[PDB]
Amino acid sequence: SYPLSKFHFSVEWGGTKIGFTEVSGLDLETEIIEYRHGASPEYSKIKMPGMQKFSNITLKRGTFKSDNEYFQWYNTINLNKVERRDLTISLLNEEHEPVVTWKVKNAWPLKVQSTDLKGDGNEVAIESMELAHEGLVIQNE
Amino acid sequence: SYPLSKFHFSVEWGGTKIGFTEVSGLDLETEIIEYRHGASPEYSKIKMPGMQKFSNITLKRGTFKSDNEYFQWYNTINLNKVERRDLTISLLNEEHEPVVTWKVKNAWPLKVQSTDLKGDGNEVAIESMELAHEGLVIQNE
Amino acid sequence: SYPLSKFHFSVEWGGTKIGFTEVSGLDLETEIIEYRHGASPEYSKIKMPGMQKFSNITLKRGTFKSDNEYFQWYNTINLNKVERRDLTISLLNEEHEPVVTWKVKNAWPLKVQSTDLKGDGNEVAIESMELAHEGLVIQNE
Amino acid sequence: SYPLSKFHFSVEWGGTKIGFTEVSGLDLETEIIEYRHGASPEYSKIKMPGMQKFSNITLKRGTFKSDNEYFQWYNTINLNKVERRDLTISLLNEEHEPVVTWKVKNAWPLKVQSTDLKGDGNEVAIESMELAHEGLVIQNE
Amino acid sequence: MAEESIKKATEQFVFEPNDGNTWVRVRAMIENFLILQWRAGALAGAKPEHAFYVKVGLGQTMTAQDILEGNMNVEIGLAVVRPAEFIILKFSHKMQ
Amino acid sequence: HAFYVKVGLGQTMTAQDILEGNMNVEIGLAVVRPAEFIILKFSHKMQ
Amino acid sequence: MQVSSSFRSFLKLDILHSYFLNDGEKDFSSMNEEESKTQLKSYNWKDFLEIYPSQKTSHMMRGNKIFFKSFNDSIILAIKVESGTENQPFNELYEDESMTFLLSLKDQYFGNYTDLDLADQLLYFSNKTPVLPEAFTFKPIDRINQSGTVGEEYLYEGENKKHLLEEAHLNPGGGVLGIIQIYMKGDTPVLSLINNDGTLKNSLPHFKIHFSNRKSTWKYINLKDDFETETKKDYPLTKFGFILLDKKSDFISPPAHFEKYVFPNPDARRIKITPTKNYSEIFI
Amino acid sequence: PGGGVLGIIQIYMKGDTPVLSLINNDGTLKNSLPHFKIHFSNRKSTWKYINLKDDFETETKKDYPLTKFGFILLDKKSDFISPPAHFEKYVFPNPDARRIKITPTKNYSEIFI
Amino acid sequence: SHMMRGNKIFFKSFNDSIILAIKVESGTENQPFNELYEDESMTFLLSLKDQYFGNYT
Amino acid sequence: EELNYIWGTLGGRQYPSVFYKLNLIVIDRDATTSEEGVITNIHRNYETL
Amino acid sequence: MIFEVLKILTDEVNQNFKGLEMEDSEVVLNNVALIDSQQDVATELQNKVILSMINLREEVTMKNFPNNVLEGTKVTYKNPKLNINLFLIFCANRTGYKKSLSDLSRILEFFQHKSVFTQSNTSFDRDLEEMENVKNFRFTMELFTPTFEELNYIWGTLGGRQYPSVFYKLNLIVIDRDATTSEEGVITNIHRNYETL
Amino acid sequence: EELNYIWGTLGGRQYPSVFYKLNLIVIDRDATTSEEGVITNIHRNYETL
Amino acid sequence: EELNYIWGTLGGRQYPSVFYKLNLIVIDRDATTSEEGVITNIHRNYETL
């Protein structure tokens, strides 16, 4: 058929703007359990799945005037309480409709990083955020 | 709209001059607490926010005649005493007015680094300072 | 064939909740009676079974708002009387059904241990209980 | 539902300050009385509750200029007399209100331990106290 | 109880475009709710796949006529646990 | 929830203040109040 | 178990400001259809104003199934209706029910370009005459087909101000520009939302709020040539328009070499306001 | 219970007539492989062309079929109802099958220029 | 599926068609290995994957 | 190194020059692809699975 | 299919200039490297926009796909298909420098609005004799902007004197002879033999 | 490597040469954008929140 | 970068082109250097060290 490209995408996160520059960290991983008893004629181990793990998601975008959304979400931490959100990330075709969707439950931010300030170059300001979550389901149909 | 650039900025630190070359280390981070009991049908953990952390800020500028400000602040350390200052860092527009401001409380210096001396190159002298602090608030409105 | 894992289980103890983070002490033990008479050709002793013993059972879990159950059971002790309960511990399959069951007769709380407190400690408050009992039967069919 | 953390708490002990870095020893314990008669079909013993016990409570904090309170309370001991106090320990919520309270009857200072000194040691001077008491009640409503 | 929560989830789209972007968001919101109810033990089933289903979209719940009228159709199923009412104890002599 | 501070054109100042040379600062504070009267009510326990 | 619902428009409000919509001397209100559309494409009321319901209003709206939607030039409320019809509210509405919305500003230069004397006063709009402790006059929120802009007729002070702020139960931090209060039944049929039998009206009520822009004398300063000059008449401040000044006759005491000079239009960031004329200083 | 079924196909070893059966009377497989067919038809519609910049609309005179790979050339003024003043400079694309208005009479496909 | 396993009937597919095949007795072309009866039947289900099927069909 | 790249595509013989960087020219045809109506009716169906 | 795809693309840009009532702008397929060669080709290039092909690549994700056909009880064997990406340039060579900058805006505006091209989309003449081999196609256009080091590489192979230009990347031309190598019959008899070892 | 870059933009045929680096030419138009008066009155308002 | 290297040694003005890689031309003169006879007798001598 025709392979998909990765430069057209959108993110629904509960803010005003959905345009970002990069997304990373959409992975699934299971730990392994191994076993051997002494009477086996093979001298290697047998393997089983065990407990599951999820990794943190990083989002990056540019800095604009009168948009303090990153800091407003991070400011809802009060001792053990936070505002948890659903996160929907889609890969789009040429008529801007979803093709592959990543569905994330119970997300909250743990790290907010601002831009660094340099005098000599010509560069725009990028801000970054890291999210913790409790599960991910991939839909491609 | 139009994205912001990162080469026009100012720092209010209690000294005479406000022009610097680079700023880094303006971050926020929260540690994580995890939990699972044995009867849960999901085989992964649930996540909460816990204690908070701040990272050190680095400032760099050039070396000039009759300006020993870095060493004068570092020389106020007497056993457990130091002069703590407020720090205000702003990103400026084309008419030199603030747009994004980082507000820092209770800062004091812990490392002062001088330039290295080399004979063969053509290079100016840069001095650097590292600061410890107790909190940061971002204002963009 | 593969062995069973040890992280999916439940405990029925006469309380509101069945989830725990740790269970230990499900042991069985007997005494040995030794004998030798002077005319024996062997210089070792002959052994036979003595009286039976059981170990105490330890249960641990996190603390929650408004759940004061460990204290309420303990507080039923009145001189030589106490509320005794049947304790059922079960290791579960993928359908969340029992596979291996440990049946415990007449349990009662010897000791209740509360959470320690640390100004700089990032963690979950854990509470624990130690139970006396009069017998253990193991079922695996 | 999420469990409570263990780093935000306060202690009321009849002193000027309520902040501590560590609290430990909030335990409850009872004795076991065992019995068997010769004709029983079982070769194990029957168990019932005995007398009650309590553990000593340890409190730690840093030292401050002009705060000589640990020594002043200890110094109220005069042969068989001592000033006894009601000790209240509380685990706090995000509004800084009590959630779980430990109520302790008749406490008095057994031991006061001062700070060690090191020529090359970079750290806070810590002092500690060990308290005797006559009873503990746990409230979580 | 389940209806109150689901209703709030779909009311957020009263004057939104009726297209694929909406259908995906609506479905994701509903499933996350139901997964949590399953995790807490409200629903039967070894995995969420056996506890419930949600369907939204052209070709599943909608046709061309619904796009024209401005309708959005959401279909939901749930596996709900039932109680025991009668316990019967049968007694006999042991043979031996 | 404890305090607020407001300074600036459009918040505390207008064009007239810029012209005159004024600076207006607005501050609010949440201050704690004491208990004065403790009332103890006694009764017989019913049982 | 089948569940169904249906929603219909309940009330529309038009939010305009001349600073962003006019083009130099050309008044938005006198533009033709293509001209009007063109100007609207660059306008968004949320660039300067923030609008939201009071806590009591939010509670009521939830109970009565009333929703709040917004567009770059307007606000539309929508209501749940009975299945099978177009005009019967699901829940019965009563004549004295009302909704209260608050206005606040985000644009720090609003006061420089907006021609309204807001010093120490509350701006108030409604479709029903209030009952206040001191004598006052009253005019309603204007309809979409009426002329005019926001003026002094909508400002309150003293005890009347205090009274209105208290009834609306506002937060101690203040920062309120004004209050908008709409009743289901107003002082006349053309301002009401419903008919006598509770039926929704068959013509959507359509109200308007429009702010005017400030004018000033332009002063040009040339330090290197050491000369100053002023225009003869005031010109409007606008965001996107342009006024060309190119005749000696346009100025009071024009320079000797006028033909080589260019005269830029002023911004609205700095302005001198006096009881008579306003002034804008421009450096060359 | 999840449904989602379009239809059901049921084949019996012995049908209502010999030509629809799989086997003979003695159980022997037939000597001519049974060969059945299912064929779906395609929908037709009126094409409407919308030109916003020139502010004009036009429609074709007769319905045309929707297909995935074919192409219909429309190039005469006579093909249209109320064709534009400068028809000679315009190109009229064929519609997709992603959006269509279905009514009891005609179906319509809207195409923007 | 259960019946097809029992009677040795297989399901194959091509871009324009479906063909079923059956095990036969060794040495011949037309005798099914297992006896078939007149009222036995096979049921197949149809479902759609193309979301636009209803617009063009 | 960058001056060698720039004058390598202009001939190879430099002249006195300054370089500038211009920001944000907006290119947009502003044409319409489609029009549709918004959601006004919601129906929910429940079954016991 | 290289010439036929680029000839179709040349007609779509020329149709867009016609709808805007611009009678001076026309795109021509030739090579940019001979603009100032001064040998018999440069007279065709004057006062025109020139479209050229500068590079060829191969799509890697589809390289190991098979291409056999099954029908009845018979299989035919074929070689796997070749898939090719292109890199293109639009080079404006008008008499006035101001006119070249106006044509480059129109080309940037055209591909901003329409990026997918099919056999049903386009308006090329199907009856033409040179286009008798084309049946079904689909390709996308995507804007490509190089760095200063990459521009030095590109114009280093075209002369060393740049012109106002834009660069594009074309996706998936399919090249396939569709010839048969072999035919065989499928498996219809299975025999199994067992022995005690 | 640097000599190849420098003479690559000057023709490609070197001559006997020395190179120097000059420090700090100041470029400034020294024009006025605005004039304002300084702070002379301060007012503070307190409320119990 | 590779196209710039290839056309840099062919003139600097490219043409429409495709590139191919050919495998295994064998070059061998097949001449004799020496001839000898193989091992046919083996002798072993042992001593006590």
Numbering used by the authors:
A (entry chain 1a), B (entry chain 1b), C (entry chain 2a), D (entry chain 2b): 2 to 142
E (entry chain 2B): 595 to 690
F (entry chain 2C): 644 to 690
G (entry chain 1B): 1 to 284
H (entry chain 1A): 172 to 284
I (entry chain 1A): 58 to 114
J (entry chain 0F), L (entry chain 0E), M (entry chain 0B): 149 to 197
K (entry chain 0A): 1 to 197
Task: Quote the study on this structure.
CISs are macromolecular injection devices with an overall structure that is homologous to the contractile tails of bacteriophages. Their conserved modules include an inner tube, a contractile sheath and a baseplate complex. For firing of the extended apparatus, the baseplate undergoes a conformational change and triggers sheath contraction, which in turn causes the inner tube to be expelled and injected into a target. Here we performed structural and mechanistic studies on a clade Ib CIS gene cluster in the marine bacterium Algoriphagus machipongonensis PR1.
